[PDB]
Amino acid sequence: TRSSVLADALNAINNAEKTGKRQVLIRPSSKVIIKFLQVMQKHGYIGEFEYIDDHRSGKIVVQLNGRLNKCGVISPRFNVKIGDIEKWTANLLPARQFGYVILTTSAGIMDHEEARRKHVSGKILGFVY
Amino acid sequence: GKGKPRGLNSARKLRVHRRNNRWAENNYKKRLLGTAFKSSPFGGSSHAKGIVLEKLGIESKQPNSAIRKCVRVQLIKNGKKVTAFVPNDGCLNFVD
Amino acid sequence: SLPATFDLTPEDAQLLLAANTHLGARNVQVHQEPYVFNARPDGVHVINVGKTWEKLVLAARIIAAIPNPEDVVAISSRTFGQRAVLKFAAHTGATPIAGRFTPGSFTNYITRSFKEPRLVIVTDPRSDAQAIKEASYVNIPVIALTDLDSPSEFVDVAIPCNNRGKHSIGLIWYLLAREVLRLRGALVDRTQPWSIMPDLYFYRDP
Amino acid sequence: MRAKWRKKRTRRLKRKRRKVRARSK
Amino acid sequence: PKKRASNGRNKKGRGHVKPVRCVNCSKSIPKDKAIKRMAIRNIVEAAAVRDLSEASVYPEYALPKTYNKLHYCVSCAIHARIVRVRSREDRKNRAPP
Amino acid sequence: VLVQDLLHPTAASEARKHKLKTLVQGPRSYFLDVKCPGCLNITTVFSHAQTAVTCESCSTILCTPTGGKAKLSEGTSFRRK
Amino acid sequence: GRVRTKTVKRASKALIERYYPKLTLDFQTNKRLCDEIATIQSKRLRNKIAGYTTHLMKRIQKGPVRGISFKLQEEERERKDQYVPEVSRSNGVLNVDNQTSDLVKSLGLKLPLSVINVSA
Amino acid sequence: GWVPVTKLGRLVKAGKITTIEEIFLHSLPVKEFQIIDTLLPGLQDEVMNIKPVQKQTRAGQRTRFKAVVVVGDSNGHVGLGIKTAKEVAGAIRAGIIIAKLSVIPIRRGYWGTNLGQPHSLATKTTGKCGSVTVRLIPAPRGSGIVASPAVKKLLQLAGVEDVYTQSNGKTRTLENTLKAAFVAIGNTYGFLTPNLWAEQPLPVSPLDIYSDEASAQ
Amino acid sequence: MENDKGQLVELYVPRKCSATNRIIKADDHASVQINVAKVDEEGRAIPGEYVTYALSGYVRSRGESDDSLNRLAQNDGLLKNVWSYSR
RNA sequence: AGGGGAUCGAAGAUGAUCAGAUACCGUCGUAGUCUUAACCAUAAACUAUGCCGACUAGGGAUCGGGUGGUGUUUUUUUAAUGACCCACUCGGCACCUUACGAGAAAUCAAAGUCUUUGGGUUCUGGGGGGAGUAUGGUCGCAAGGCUGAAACUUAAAGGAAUUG
Ligand SMILES: [Mg+2]
Ligand SMILES: [Mg+2]
Ligand SMILES: [Mg+2]
Ligand SMILES: [Mg+2]
Ligand SMILES: [Mg+2]
Ligand SMILES: [Mg+2]
Ligand SMILES: [Mg+2]
Ligand SMILES: [Mg+2]
Ligand SMILES: [Mg+2]
Ligand SMILES: [Mg+2]
Ligand SMILES: [Mg+2]
Ligand SMILES: [Mg+2]
Ligand SMILES: [Mg+2]
Ligand SMILES: [Mg+2]
Ligand SMILES: [Mg+2]
Ligand SMILES: [Mg+2]
Ligand SMILES: [Mg+2]
Ligand SMILES: [Mg+2]
Ligand SMILES: [Mg+2]
Ligand SMILES: [Mg+2]
Ligand SMILES: [Mg+2]
Ligand SMILES: [Mg+2]
Ligand SMILES: [Mg+2]
Ligand SMILES: [Mg+2]
Ligand SMILES: [Mg+2]
Ligand SMILES: [Mg+2]
Ligand SMILES: [Mg+2]
Ligand SMILES: [Zn+2]
Ligand SMILES: [Zn+2]
Domain count, chain I: 1
Bridge-based pairing state of the strands H163-168 and H145-146: parallel
DSSP string, F13-46: HHHHS-SSSSSS------EEE-B-TT-SS--EEE
Torsion of CA C100, C104, C105, C107, to 10 degrees: 170
Output the CA angle G43-G47-G53, nearest 5 degrees. 145
CB neighbours of H187 closer than 8 A, spacing ≥ 6?
A: H125, H126, H127
Cα dist from G6 to A88, B76, C112, G12, G48, whole Å = 71, 90, 20, 9, 11
Taking alpha carbons only, the member of C88, C75, C191 closest to residue C144 is: C75
Interface of I with A in 24-63 (CB under 8 A): 58-59, 62
Residues of I in contact with F1 (CB under 8 A): 64, 67-68
Nucleotide nearest to A7 (CA to C1'): J119
Of H92, H110, H216, nearest in space to H161 by CA = H110
I5 touches chain C (CB under 8 A): no
List CB-based neighbours of ion ligand 8 within 5 Å. E 8, 11
Domain boundary, last residue among H78, H105, H132 = H105
| Order of strands, sheet of H163-168, starting from the edge strand that comes earlier in the sequence | H125-127, H133-138, H163-168, H145-146
Reading phi first (left if > 0) and then psi (alpha if -120 to 50, else beta), residue D7 is in alpha
Which residues of B, range 1-20, sit inside 8 Å of A by Cβ?
1, 6-8
At residue F18's C-alpha, the angle toward residues F13 and F23, to 5°, is 65
Question: Which residue intervals of A5-129 are DSSP H helices?
Answer: 5-18, 31-43, 85-92, 112-118
Q: How far is the CA of E43 from the C1' of J15 (A)?
A: 38
| Residue–nucleotide distance: C30 CA to J58 C1' (Å) | 8
| CA distances from residue G71 to C111, E45, G20, G38 in whole angstroms, order as listed | 17, 63, 11, 21
Residues ≥6 apart with Cβ < 8 Å to A89: A96, A99, A101, A112
Do C136 and I63 form a contact (C-beta atoms < 8 A)? Answer: no
CA distance I83 to I87: 10
In this complex, the nucleotide whose C1' atom is nearest to the CA atom of residue E10 is J94
Task: Give the single-character DSSP code of I43.
Answer: E
Residues of H whose CB is below 8 A from C118: 207-208, 211
Chains that touch D (3 or more CB pairs under 8 A): none
In angstroms, the CA H116 to CA H99 distance is 30
CA geometry: angle at G80 spanning G77 and G81, to 5°?
105
Give dist(CA C174, CA C12) in Å, integer. Answer: 12
Nearest by CB to A22, which of F3, F24, F25? F3
Q: Are C177 and C91 in contact (CB under 8 A)?
A: yes
Q: Is the separation of the CB atoms in H9 and H34 below 8 Å?
A: yes
CA dist H55 and C80 (Å) reads: 47
G85: contact with C, CB 8 A cutoff: yes
Are H26 and I12 within 8 A, CB to CB?
no
Element (H, E) at D17: helix D3-22
Cβ atoms H70, H80 nearer than 8 A: yes
H or E element in which residue E29 lies:
strand E28-30
Report CA(E85)–ligand 14 centroid distance (Å): 26
> Considering CB atoms only, which of H21, H118, H204 is closest to I50?
H204
Residues H68, H140 within the same domain: no
Angle formed at CA C19 by CA C15 and CA C24, multiple of 5 degrees: 120
Determine whether G94 is exposed, middle or buried from the number of CB atoms within 10 Å of its CB (0-12, 13-18, 19+): middle
What CA–CA distance (Å, rounded) separates H144 from C57?
A: 57
Residue F36 in contact with residue F45, Cβ under 8 Å? no
I20 touches chain C (CB under 8 A): no
Cβ count near C151 (within 10 Å): 16
Closest residue by Cα to residue F53 from F30, F75, F70: F70
Measured CB to CB, residues of chain A less than 8 Å from chain H are: 43-44, 66-67, 69, 94-98
Question: For A1-68, CATH number?
Answer: 3.30.1370.30
SS3 I70: helix
Total domains in chain H come to 2
Which residues of chain H have a CB within 8 Å of the CB of C68? Answer: 211-212, 214-215
A59 pairs with which residues across the strands? A52
Tell me how far apart the alpha carbons of residues B58 and B64 are, in angstroms, rounded to a whole number: 12
Domain residue extents for chain B: 1-96
H112·A96 Cβ contact <8 A: yes
Query: Which bases in strand J are touched by protein, i.e. have an atom under 7 Å from a CB?
Result: 47-48, 50-60, 65-68, 71-72, 81, 85-90, 93-97, 100, 102-108, 112-127, 131-135, 143-144, 150-152, 154, 159-164
Indicate if the alpha-carbon torsion angle C112, C117, C121, C126 is positive or negative. Answer: positive
CA dihedral C135, C141, C146, C150 (to 10 degrees): 40
CA G65 distance to own-chain centroid: 8
Of the candidates C58, C155, C189, which has its C-beta nearest I42's C-beta? C189
Ramachandran angles phi, psi of H25, nearest 5° = -50, -40
Domain that holds residue F23: 1-81
Q: How far is it, in rounded angstroms, from Cα I22 to Cα D3?
A: 58
Q: Which of H111, H124, H194 sits opposite A98 (nearest CB)?
A: H194
> Distances from the Cα of C190 to the Cαs of C12, C172, G110, H135, in angstroms?
13, 20, 21, 64
Method: X-ray
Question: Counting runs of H as helices and runs of E as strands, what totals does chain E give?
Answer: 2, 4
Residue with CA nearest C1' of nucleotide J68: F16
Q: How many CB atoms lie within 10 A of CB B63?
A: 5
Query: Any chain C CB within 8 A of the CB of H101?
Result: no
Instruction: Write out the residue range of the structural domain in which residue H159 sits.
Output: 106-199
C39 interaction partners in chain I (CB closer than 8 Å): none
Say how far apart CA B33 and CA I68 lie, in whole Å: 68
The CA distances from residue C23 to A78, C205, H207, in Å, are 62, 22, 39
How are beta strands F31-33 and F44-46 bridged, if at all?
antiparallel
CB–CB of A20/I57 below 8 Å?
Answer: no
The three-point CA angle A48-F22-A38 to 5° equals 20
What is the DSSP secondary structure assignment for residue C137, as one 8-state letter? Answer: G
Q: How many CB atoms lie within 10 A of CB C118?
A: 24
The neighbour count for residue G100, using CB atoms within 10 Å, is 19
Angstrom distance (rounded) from CA E17 to CA H131:
42
Note residues around ion ligand 6 (Cβ under 5 angstroms). D 23
Cβ contact A76–B1 (<8 Å): no
C139 touches chain H (CB under 8 A): yes
Q: Is A65 on the interface with I (CB under 8 A)?
A: yes
**How do beta strands C120-122 and C142-146 pair?**
parallel
The SS3 assignment for A59 reads: strand
C-alpha H136/C-alpha H180 separation (Å) is 11
Interhelix angle C170-182/C10-17, rounded to 10 degrees, is 150
CATH of the domain at H12: 3.30.160.20
Cα separation of C158 and E9, whole Å? Answer: 44
Resolution, Å (one decimal): 3.2
Please give the class, per CATH, of domain A69-129.
alpha beta
Nearest residue to G93 via CA among G116, G111, G112, G108:
G112
I36 membership: H or E segment, kind and range: strand I32-40
Contact I21 A65 (CB under 8 A): yes
- Sequence-distant (6+) residues with CB within 8 A of F79 are F32, F33
- Secondary structure of chain B as H, E, C letters: CCCCCCCCCCHHHHHHHHHHHHHHCHHHHHHHHCHHHHCCCCCCCCCCCEEEEEEEEEECCCCCCCEEEEEEEEECCCCCEEEEECCCCCCCCCCC
In angstroms, rounded to a whole number, what is the distance separating the alpha carbons of residues C119 and H37? 29
Residue I87 and residue F8: Cβ atoms within 8 Å? no
3-state secondary structure chain G: CCCCCHHHHHHHHHHHCCCCCCCCCCHHHHHHHHHHHCCCCCHHHHHHHHHHHHHHHHHHCCCCCCCCCCCCCHHHHCCCCCCCCCCCCCCCCCCCCCCHHHCCCCCCCCCCCCCCCCCC
CA distance C172 to C87: 12
Cα-based angle H9, H12, H18 (whole degrees, multiple of 5) = 145
Phi, psi of H115 (to 5 degrees): -45, 140
In chain A, where the domains are located: 1-68, 69-129
What residue ranges in C99-185 does DSSP mark as E strands? 120-122, 142-146, 158-160
| Beta-carbon separation of I20 and A66 below 8 A | yes
Among all residues of chain F, which has the CA nearest to that of I67? F1
- Cβ-proximal residues to A51 (8 Å cutoff; 6+ apart), any chain: A29, A34, A58, A59, A60
Nearest to A8 by CA among A97, A87, A93, A73: A73
Closest Cβ–Cβ partner in C40, C197, C199 for G98: C40
CA of F51 to C1' of J70 (A): 31
Residues paired with I65 in a beta bridge: none
Domain around I2: 1-87
Going from the Cα of D6 to the center of ligand 6, the distance in angstroms, rounded, reads: 30
Closest nucleotide to A74 by C1' from CA? J118
Does the beta carbon of G45 lie under 8 angstroms from any beta carbon of chain C? no
Could you give all domains of chain C from N- to C-terminal order, each with its CATH number? 10-200 (3.40.50.10490)
- Distance between CA atoms of residues H21 and I58, nearest Å: 22
The separation, in Å, between residue E13 CA and nucleotide J24 C1' comes to 37
- AA identity, residue F17: K
Distance separating alpha carbons of residues C171 and C19, to the nearest angstrom? 7
Q: How many angstroms away from the CA of F74 is the closest CA of chain A?
A: 39
How many helices, marked H, and strands, marked E, lie in chain F? 1, 2
Per the omega criterion (within 30 degrees of 0), is the bond before F27 cis?
A: no
Contact A52 F23 (CB under 8 A): yes
Q: How far is H214 from chain C (nearest CA, A)?
A: 10
